[PDB]
Amino acid sequence: TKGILGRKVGMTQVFTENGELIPVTVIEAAQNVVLQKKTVETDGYEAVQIGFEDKRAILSNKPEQGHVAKANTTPKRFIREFRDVNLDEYEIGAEVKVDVFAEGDIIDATGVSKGKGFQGVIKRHGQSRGPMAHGSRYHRRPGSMGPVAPNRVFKNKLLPGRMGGEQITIQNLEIVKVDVEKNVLLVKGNVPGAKKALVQIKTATK
Amino acid sequence: MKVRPSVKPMCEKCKVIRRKGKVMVICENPKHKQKQ
Amino acid sequence: RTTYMAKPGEVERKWYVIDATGVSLGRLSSEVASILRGKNKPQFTPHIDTGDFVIIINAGKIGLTGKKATDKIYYRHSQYPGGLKSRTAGEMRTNNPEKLLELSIKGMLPKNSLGRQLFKKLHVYGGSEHEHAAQQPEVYEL
Amino acid sequence: IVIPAGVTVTLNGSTATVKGPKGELVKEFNPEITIKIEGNEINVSRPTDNKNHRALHGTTRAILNNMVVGVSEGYEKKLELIGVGYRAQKQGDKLVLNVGYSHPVEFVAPKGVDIEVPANTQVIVKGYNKEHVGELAANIRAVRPPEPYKGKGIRYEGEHVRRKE
RNA sequence: GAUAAACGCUGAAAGCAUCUAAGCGUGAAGCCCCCCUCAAGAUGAGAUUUCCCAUUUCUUCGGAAAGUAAGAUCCCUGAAA
RNA sequence: UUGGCACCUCGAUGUCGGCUCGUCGCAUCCUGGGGCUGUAGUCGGUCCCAAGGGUUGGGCUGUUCGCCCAUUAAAGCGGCAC
Ligand SMILES: [Mg+2]
Ligand SMILES: [Mg+2]
Ligand SMILES: [Mg+2]
Ligand SMILES: [Mg+2]
Ligand SMILES: [Mg+2]
Ligand SMILES: [Mg+2]
Ligand SMILES: [Mg+2]
Ligand SMILES: [Mg+2]
Ligand SMILES: [Mg+2]
Ligand SMILES: [Mg+2]
Ligand SMILES: [Mg+2]
Ligand SMILES: [Zn+2]
């Protein structure tokens, strides 16, 4: 199992050799370094900790500087662990390049979905509106809070609240192209998050 | 299988047994299989 | 008037280690509850906690008579609609015996703030090894 | 229970190991029931006349008898495929049956059992552990049990199948 | 992975027979995992890596307060929020 | 369900159908597993296990219900102040 961290650049399309036209997400994944290897002896589980994008000194603190000094690298914007990887691969301070993947490799893209703020039950939970005419005074409301008997509301009565900004994993995206000199992956279809969003690309669990 | 509170031999070949605290009759004739 | 009342940290609380091997889950639990509560000491004071600390070892070998292994069900409700989970005493003695004894003993402790403090004095281990050697635990017989 | 020539029977606490020419067996019995091992003959002892003991008594006798007879002349369960295009091929340690499915069905024998196939129409299962022989034999019959209309499928050699129109 | 109904194997009680009593196996969209998300206020408050260091005056005593370290905040420019 | 009784509520416990939102039971409509069959096959019948998910859109009527049209793997039956 291989993994890397990139920023979502944006979406475009590419023509396949077949002639078909597919939508792609451009993930730029430059400056991935291996910072720390966690073992069963030390931390109780196997994981490699990858630091992604370089960060100006003044934006880091002494705790951070000490951590990346162990891997002879500069402070890193994003640090994430990958489990299920082979620790024999990965040396501390080693760069992790996008060529760990090849065209046709099936990957799982994990990121934080775009923020929609406070949202009602219609957008947040796909509930039905009440009628818009015929005397209706019910339109974008949550529906009955429940029966009478349990003098209270059950625990999964879906209601308005903050909508996006959740971690999402899209499973089984094909890698379409891998450009090493540009540190670019092209992934068929879309991945969560706004442009510039952190995206964690790892080999498909399935 | 006949599942019924009244389980009893339906012919001479029918044997009444108990499996897992359940009365049943087993028989050469499969129609006579009964469990209580 | 004159009846003695224990003060907090007055009565010497001792560490006991008890082998669960082959003892009925109850029977072990009921004796341990009494030790935790301090019912075996004449200084016993109902509002204070004068009891001892108890380590139980070999909880995986705890006895379940009859068909309790398969038929004694432990329920949990999440408080979500239809959120009732169930485990057999048998499965829980195999996988989470520390949990099995804690449930059993928790039920036999007073259902109050002091009862919740008493539960903190109970250490259960599936195997023969604990890590409370520093507390110099003394073997206790039922 | 008579012990034949070549067999050596030993008792270690409750368990009893039996090592002979055909193979070697280990089976753990209930403790309270005691076994008196002698050079020629084996007499199993029952302490009390309680329902539990009456049952275990006959079982300890039966299994020990089966174990000893097991390692002597060996156990043989014979099977007989019926129906057009029903055959069995032996290739390596795998018994490959073609019994009318779109896929072929294959069996790899456990430790101490053999599946030699004289003719394509019949199968024979050799072994010393009678229950291991019985199970594998049943598992092979389980693939296509005999149907009641034309009698097609895998049957035991002595088996009597009920027939219909 | 373990099971339901069910099917068996070996097998006595009950010289036979019998899937069951001891003992083995098969066996469901169901159970427990696997998959996705939250999650140590899990007060049982866990773990790993890294950073800062043992200051001053008091308090008989325990402790107290008052400059700081690493670090954080106020305030300000903002949006991907 | 049709009822019996008159125990809470007459200084008010809003009553049918629909909508919205469901949630629960299993006596299971579909899908999964299975026994018997007057089970050749394809279809079925009947019983057992099974509540994970699923279980349509119209015409008529305030309707519930029901009939009908056209689908569907299926168009389940009940409880939650009908
Ligand atoms: Mg936003
Ligand atoms: Mg609508
Ligand atoms: Mg309006
Ligand atoms: Mg309540
Ligand atoms: Mg038999
Ligand atoms: Mg299995
Ligand atoms: Mg499905
Ligand atoms: Mg009256
Ligand atoms: Mg009033
Ligand atoms: Mg049912
Ligand atoms: Mg109503
Ligand atoms: Zn009969």
From Swiss-Prot, chain A:
One of its GO terms (molecular function) is rRNA binding. Keywords: Ribonucleoprotein, Ribosomal protein, RNA-binding, rRNA-binding. GO terms for biological process: translation. It comes from the Bacteria. SUPFAM superfamilies: Translation proteins. Residues 125-147 are annotated as: Disordered. GO terms for cellular component: cytosolic large ribosomal subunit. Belongs to the universal ribosomal protein uL3 family. Part of the 50S ribosomal subunit. Forms a cluster with proteins L14 and L19. NCBIfam families: L3_bact. One of the primary rRNA binding proteins, it binds directly near the 3'-end of the 23S rRNA, where it nucleates assembly of the 50S subunit. This is Large ribosomal subunit protein uL3. It comes from Listeria monocytogenes serovar 1/2a (strain ATCC BAA-679 / EGD-e).
From Swiss-Prot, chain B:
SUPFAM superfamilies: Ribosomal protein L36 (SSF57840). PROSITE patterns: RIBOSOMAL_L36. GO terms for cellular component: cytoplasm; ribonucleoprotein complex; ribosome. This is Large ribosomal subunit protein bL36. Signal peptide: none annotated. The gene is rpmJ. PANTHER family: 50S RIBOSOMAL PROTEIN L36, CHLOROPLASTIC (PTHR42888), LARGE RIBOSOMAL SUBUNIT PROTEIN BL36C (PTHR42888:SF1). The keyword Ribonucleoprotein applies. Keywords: Ribonucleoprotein, Ribosomal protein. The keyword Signal does not apply. NCBIfam families: rpmJ_bact. InterPro entries: Ribosomal_bL36, Ribosomal_bL36_sp. One of its GO terms (molecular function) is structural constituent of ribosome. GO terms for biological process: translation. Belongs to the bacterial ribosomal protein bL36 family.
Curated annotation (Swiss-Prot), chain C:
Keywords: Ribonucleoprotein, Ribosomal protein. Disulfide bonds: none annotated. It comes from the Bacteria. It holds the Pfam family Ribosomal_L13. GO terms for cellular component: cytosolic large ribosomal subunit; ribosome. GO terms for molecular function: mRNA binding; structural constituent of ribosome. The keyword Ribonucleoprotein applies. GO terms for biological process: negative regulation of translation; translation. Coiled coil: none annotated. Part of the 50S ribosomal subunit. Belongs to the universal ribosomal protein uL13 family. This protein is one of the early assembly proteins of the 50S ribosomal subunit, although it is not seen to bind rRNA by itself. It is important during the early stages of 50S assembly. NCBIfam families: rplM_bact (TIGR01066). PANTHER family: LARGE RIBOSOMAL SUBUNIT PROTEIN UL13M (PTHR11545:SF2), RIBOSOMAL PROTEIN L13 (PTHR11545). HAMAP family: Ribosomal_uL13. This is Large ribosomal subunit protein uL13. It comes from Listeria monocytogenes serovar 1/2a (strain ATCC BAA-679 / EGD-e).
UniProtKB/Swiss-Prot annotation, chain D:
This is Large ribosomal subunit protein uL6. This protein binds to the 23S rRNA, and is important in its secondary structure. It is located near the subunit interface in the base of the L7/L12 stalk, and near the tRNA binding site of the peptidyltransferase center. One of its GO terms (molecular function) is structural constituent of ribosome. Part of the 50S ribosomal subunit. It comes from the Bacteria. Keywords: Ribonucleoprotein, Ribosomal protein, RNA-binding, rRNA-binding. Belongs to the universal ribosomal protein uL6 family. One of its GO terms (cellular component) is cytosolic large ribosomal subunit. NCBIfam families: L6_bact (TIGR03654). It comes from Listeria monocytogenes serovar 1/2a (strain ATCC BAA-679 / EGD-e). One of its GO terms (biological process) is cytoplasmic translation. The lineage of its organism: Bacteria, Bacillati, Bacillota, Bacilli, Bacillales.
